[PDB]
Design a protein around this ligand. Structure first.
Ligand code: MG
Ligand code: MG
Ligand code: MG
Ligand code: MG
Ligand code: MG
Ligand code: MG
Ligand code: MG
Ligand code: MG
Ligand code: MG
Ligand code: MG
Ligand code: MG
Ligand code: MG
Ligand code: MG
Ligand code: MG
Ligand code: MG
Ligand code: MG
Ligand code: MG
Ligand code: MG
Ligand code: MG
Ligand code: MG
Ligand code: MG
Ligand code: MG
Ligand code: MG
Ligand code: MG
Ligand code: MG
Ligand code: MG
Ligand code: MG
Ligand code: MG
Ligand code: MG
Ligand code: MG
Ligand code: MG
Ligand code: MG
Ligand code: MG
Ligand code: MG
Ligand code: MG
Ligand code: MG
Ligand code: MG
Ligand code: MG
Ligand code: MG
Ligand code: MG
Ligand code: MG
Ligand code: MG
Lengths: 258, 142
RNA sequence: UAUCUGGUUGAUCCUGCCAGUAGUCAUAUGCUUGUCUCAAAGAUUAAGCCAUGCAUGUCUAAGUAUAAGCAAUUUAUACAGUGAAACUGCGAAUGGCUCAUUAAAUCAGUUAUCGUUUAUUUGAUAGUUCCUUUACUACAUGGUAUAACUGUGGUAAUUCUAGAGCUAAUACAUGCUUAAAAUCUCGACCCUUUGGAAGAGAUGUAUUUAUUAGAUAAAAAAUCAAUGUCUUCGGACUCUUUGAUGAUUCAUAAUAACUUUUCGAAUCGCAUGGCCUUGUGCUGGCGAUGGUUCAUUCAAAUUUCUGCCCUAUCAACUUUCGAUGGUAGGAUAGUGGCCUACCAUGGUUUCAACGGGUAACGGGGAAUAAGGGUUCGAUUCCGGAGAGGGAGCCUGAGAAACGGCUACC
RNA sequence: GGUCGGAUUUCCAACGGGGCCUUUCCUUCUGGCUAACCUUGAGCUUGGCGAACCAGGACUUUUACUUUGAAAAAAUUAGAGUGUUCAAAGCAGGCGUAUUGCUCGAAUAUAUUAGCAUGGAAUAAUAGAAUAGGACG
RNA sequence: ACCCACUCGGCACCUUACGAGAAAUCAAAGUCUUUGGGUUCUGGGGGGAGUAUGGUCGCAAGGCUGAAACUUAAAGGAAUUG
RNA sequence: CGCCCGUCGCUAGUACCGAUUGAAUGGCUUAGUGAGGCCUCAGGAUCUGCUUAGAGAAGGGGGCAACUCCAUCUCAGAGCGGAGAAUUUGGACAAACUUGGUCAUUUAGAGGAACUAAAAGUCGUAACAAGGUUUCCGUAGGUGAACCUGCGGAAGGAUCAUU
RNA sequence: AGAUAAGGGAAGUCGGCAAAAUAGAUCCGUAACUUCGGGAUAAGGAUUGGCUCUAAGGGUCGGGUACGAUCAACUUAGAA
RNA sequence: UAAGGUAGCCAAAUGCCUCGUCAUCUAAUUAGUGACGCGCAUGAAUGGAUUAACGAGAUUCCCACUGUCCCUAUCUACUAU
């Protein structure tokens, strides 16, 4: 009402943050940034609740204000900066590098990566257009604008970003036999090797997707992120690599390693 | 539906200018488009002389959103008809259904000639009037 | 945890209700009350009225400091440490409270903006602006106030203010400094017909209008209107540029101009470095703030479909002066009877219209449940509406704002 | 049992699927992959028919119903794990030479109706060629 | 016109109870806890009360629609022995 | 010697009709008047820049003698403007008030007419047996009261019965 | 005989006698009751001038085997 | 008594007592209206009761309006002179 909201109560936050329902009435509202606040992770909850490197927002602020943490090469000393999918986070102290990817339960994992892998990121192009004076440009999933792309780069493709400059090194197209990451919905976190896509001109192009264990499913085209061709991926996959074990085999593995 | 210039203003498609200096074919420049979704633009719309600002083919509207189907129960308006969509509403206690209906006022272009009893499919557009939000895109009866 | 029992009779079997029985995040009340954890709590009647005190303010290295403030710099004679006040910039439109209004309204799920605004982030993005543009001109940077402050006062009083004297800006209000090339116009002049020219001006972005391009399923030939790039002027002829959407008059570009004319940095902190024709010469980093447009994000506004309790002792309702629609225009951020002019007579209803009632905010949900169901949901989350009742409006990206104003009651 | 109460294969059967044939089109045009290819080079070689991979197409009887899936905020409900000392709860925690550390989690299900995509095509409707202005061609 | 046999459609009747029902009784009042062939109307303890009021019809008498307050633990059905 | 109906009379309670063009409260609304701010037509207090501009006097530079040129105190006067308060025309939004109208909910009322109880009151005995005239329905009339009578109907009859 | 009167407004008088007020037209709105025909001009409100315009409402002639020309009305509505 | 006034209606234009009693209307009402009825002496084609509309009929009240009045004054014409 009357303007934008600036608070976010607990029990209204997205559940994949794993914020406890006790310990405060409010949740850290992500500031405006490159991602939607639903599919984002504030640096406060990432540093405190996933890494345990801090206990308070005061300690997170004390870490941020001395320019220790940087994300996508930029320092970003904001407590509620929305870190989203495949954003890289570099901590020069501890020489740590994380890449924000979903685990198969649908939450963000602490996926430690090396420096040569932290030197880039992939972006799913959302629209290709002609800017002013006829300059073509793309818009990635994190709102990055990249001018003068390759003319073969159409929508729903993946571009590899230099992450020091904003240039494109190469790009992956979108058709059958491509390794994808599911980012959104019930199947959020699986990796499943497109077999074919159905059009349905008028809304919500569907795509059929089968994992390494031949368990197929289907997803809207909004939630799919192609990350290479079948076999080799262009990034380091987290543990499990998006299989979505059933609860039976999950407790069998928990009884195996114990 | 007998003349195009019935109103006090000059009815014309905007920015479709036929130069009087040149003398070519294609009697007047007539702009038309395909609405998409496999709907055929009629030859009477391509060859006619009506203007119909709110036509989904010659007019400056776009069809997007829901596609519905009804039967025409009234034609007494001008370039507007009322269709009746009948549906079954389920009641969970009695484990069975009941007949309900809505009347949907839709805009009809002069490309179509509809009568009472014809079934039509309509496409959602921007608010055309106080009540009209759909536009007749294909008649499929006689 | 799919359970029944007492009461009509002199007695019987029934119908049938009354009473019992169990529960209640349903309240109140009586009596009693030792411990640990957890915890609702002026909703119901009065969205009745309020004493008093708090609940919204805010700074860095980085907008403005001669505090006649505190320090000591001792590196400083412009300042450069801290720093009240005040100007400036943001915020105060979030939160919190309540449920009065409200019955296709809100609200839920589901769409859409190819029908719009969007501070803030985040990512990109202005060599084109000296106007007779050869003195019109500061571009090692241009002007004017004014607060705080000093001092003189008013009234019983208010977060009331007047007169006088200074002084600043990222305050107001002005204003320049950067290529080249290309294309168009005019065009002096030479003058030829094949006709060529010196020179001048315009060409960023933003607004407004008009026009054009924004294409294409296939293959060859006939001649002319004039040859068209170059010729062995036979004509070999290609190269020809066209992105996206299911779909556009889309994105974008180009001509003709239009604008009372937007923007295109006169701002700030640290580090002080390289080249020498050694001059305060020319170059030169890391940031902060600001800035036009696009995209993105936070949203907002409308919007598709379907779904709401009880009433017919409400059956016809709407349309004077908006009801339903058409055309055109105004207005809006935009669609639209949203409003106006003209025109037509339309639109809803026994599949319950309209009207009335609700001790009715809606939903997620809660109680009780063999199953089906019945009742409740003011209330910890979401979405609405309100700030005693109405109405109106300034500022701002965002308010019909009320811990903001104006009027009436 | 060919492992030491865990598992395999040649097996008698049942259970559900797919394809083909029996008069049984169960849409086809432009293109490309030509695919499974008469393609056979001596026992792994030089050359068949487009969906099994697409793009555009022309058309395309309409539903209801039902299956599956996407979506349906969290909290609540049910429910997996876990010494809040039990429990209501909560989402925690657990394990080491505890000197430097390692590691599992924070599931899952339901969430009507409406809307969306998909398989079925019985059941209940609907339409077609009858003064043939019917289909193939 | 009668008689015999048969058949369709009727008004009914007699006997039994497989069945139903509280019973009286019922070839429908059966095929209903083994609860679903299609469909219309009406009732929710007894009074107050088919009253009051409001509509609507009727010349009128009246008809149709039709409450509430209040009051009560029983009224009532079929059979049994007196 | 059971049960049982109604009038009338007393007491108490509930609701109804009711003259009073009753009363009160609340909602909505016609008409009239109409604040406020907003948009517009003006308006111009005041403040202020520029172009000048002339007179009267000071100073300075120059034929050095009157005289000539440039500056300073004075005050008219003219324009070119810019900002601009009060006030003001018209318009739309429109609070609020007044007077009516209408709807809804309570609320007074002489009197009238019901119902319910209470109470062993008065008068009869209408129904239950053939209840002593068989009961009951509809309709009409009448009578102190239950009720009676007429017409038609019913068995819930006191008859399942006369080939 | 005809009139006008401040403030009040039937206190006057048997009694509002007399006088005053109202009045036409257009638009809106119109109750109880009813023999359903009425009541009804119920009650109760608004508007009305001049000037300059706009709109609508007609006749008669005209067409091989849609319209044009011409003439003349007072009726209503609206706007500055 | 021939029959004993029924249905209705009423201090009615009909009620002596009577300015009947109660309620309403008003500050105050022998008036008005609504009720009550042992009604001197109501009452059914002597027609009873009611009644929309109509009425130069009789009566009460309300709004508006006014010199009817508080409380009179002034003017004009024709008289009077
Ligand atoms: Mg935040
Ligand atoms: Mg009994
Ligand atoms: Mg007993
Ligand atoms: Mg009970
Ligand atoms: Mg309440
Ligand atoms: Mg709030
Ligand atoms: Mg930016
Ligand atoms: Mg329009
Ligand atoms: Mg319109
Ligand atoms: Mg309420
Ligand atoms: Mg809320
Ligand atoms: Mg508010
Ligand atoms: Mg209050
Ligand atoms: Mg307000
Ligand atoms: Mg307050
Ligand atoms: Mg369906
Ligand atoms: Mg027979
Ligand atoms: Mg018979
Ligand atoms: Mg009951
Ligand atoms: Mg009952
Ligand atoms: Mg009996
Ligand atoms: Mg006796
Ligand atoms: Mg007796
Ligand atoms: Mg008798
Ligand atoms: Mg007797
Ligand atoms: Mg008898
Ligand atoms: Mg009897
Ligand atoms: Mg008799
Ligand atoms: Mg009986
Ligand atoms: Mg007077
Ligand atoms: Mg009088
Ligand atoms: Mg008097
Ligand atoms: Mg007197
Ligand atoms: Mg008198
Ligand atoms: Mg008179
Ligand atoms: Mg009258
Ligand atoms: Mg009598
Ligand atoms: Mg009398
Ligand atoms: Mg009197
Ligand atoms: Mg009387
Ligand atoms: Mg007489
Ligand atoms: Mg008379």
């Amino acid at each position: 009402a009357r303007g934008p909201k600036k608070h976010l109560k607990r029990l209204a936050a997205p559940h994949h943050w794993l914020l406890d329902k006790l310990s405060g009435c409010y949740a850290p509202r992500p500031s405006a940034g490159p991602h939607k606040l639903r599919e984002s992770l504030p640096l406060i909850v990432f540093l405190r609740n996933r890494l345990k490197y801090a206990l308070n927002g005061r300690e997170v602020k004390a870490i941020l204000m001395q320019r220790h943490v940087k994300v996508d090469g930029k320092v970003r000393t904001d407590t509620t900066y929305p870190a989203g999918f495949m954003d890289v986070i570099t901590l020069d102290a501890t020489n740590e590098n994380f890449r924000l990817v979903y685990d198969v339960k649908g939450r963000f994992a602490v996926h430690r990566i090396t420096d040569e892998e932290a030197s880039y990121k992939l972006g799913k192009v959302k629209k290709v257009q002609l800017g002013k004076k006829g300059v073509p440009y793309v818009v990635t999933h994190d709102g990055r604008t990249i001018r003068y792309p390759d003319p073969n780069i159409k929508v729903n493709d993946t571009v590899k970003i230099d992450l020091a400059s904003g240039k494109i090194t190469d790009f992956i197209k979108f058709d059958a036999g491509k390794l994808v990451y599911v980012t959104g919905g019930r199947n959020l976190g699986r990796i499943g090797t497109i077999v074919h896509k159905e059009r349905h001109d008028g809304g919500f192009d569907l795509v059929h997707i089968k994992d390494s264990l031949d368990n197929t499913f289907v997803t809207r085209l909004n939630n799919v992120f192609v990350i290479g061709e079948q076999g080799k991926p262009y990034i380091s996959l987290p543990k499990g690599k998006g299989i979505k074990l059933s609860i039976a085999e999950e407790r069998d593995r928990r009884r195996a390693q114990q | 539906e007998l003349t195009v210039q019935s109103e006090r203003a000059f009815q014309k498609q905007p920015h479709i200018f036929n130069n009087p200096k040149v003398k070519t074919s294609k009697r007047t420049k007539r702009w038309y488009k395909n609405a998409g979704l496999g709907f055929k633009t009629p030859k009477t719309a391509i060859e006619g002389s009506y203007i119909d600002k709110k036509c989904p083919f010659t007019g400056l509207v776009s069809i997007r959103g829901k596609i519905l189907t009804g039967t025409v129960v009234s034609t007494k308006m001008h370039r507007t008809i009322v269709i009746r969509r009948a549906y079954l509403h389920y009641i969970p206690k009695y484990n069975r259904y009941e007949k309900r209906h809505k009347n949907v006022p839709v805009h009809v272009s002069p490309a179509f000639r509809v009568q009472v009893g014809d079934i039509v499919t309509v496409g959602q557009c921007r608010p055309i009037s106080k009540t009209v939000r759909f536009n007749v895109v294909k008649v499929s009866a006689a």
